Design a protein around this ligand. Structure first.
Ligand SMILES: [Cu+2]
Length: 102
């Protein structure tokens, strides 16, 4: 699967903001435009340790941004379920998405 992170206009959005993948299918997040963004998964309180580890590995560091230098990030989630992710800098601005794993 591919997800666009941002746009050329400067909106704080993922495109699309909902996507469905097969277990183990990578999601490639690639920056569009000049505004830096990242992607980090929410870790539900409640999630098993294995799922928490998967989600952390599928997350950028919050000291890390995609740029024209480093344009993309690839995440792989194995556990079937629905997950929410956000952009660290624009989290308050509601820059978020959902991932469904079949
Ligand atoms: Cu952002």
């Amino acid at each position: 699967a591919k997800v666009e992170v941002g746009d050329e206009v400067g909106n704080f959005k993922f495109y699309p903001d909902s996507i469905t993948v097969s277990a183990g299918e990578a999601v490639e997040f690639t920056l569009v435009g000049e505004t830096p963004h990242n992607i980090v998964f929410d870790i539900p309180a409640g999630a098993p340790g294995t799922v928490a580890s998967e989600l952390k590995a599928a997350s950028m560091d919050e000291n890390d941004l995609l740029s024209e230098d480093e344009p993309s990030f690839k995440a792989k989630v194995s556990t079937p379920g629905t997950y929410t992710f956000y952009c660290t800098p624009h989290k308050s601005a509601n820059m978020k998405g959902t991932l469904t794993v079949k």
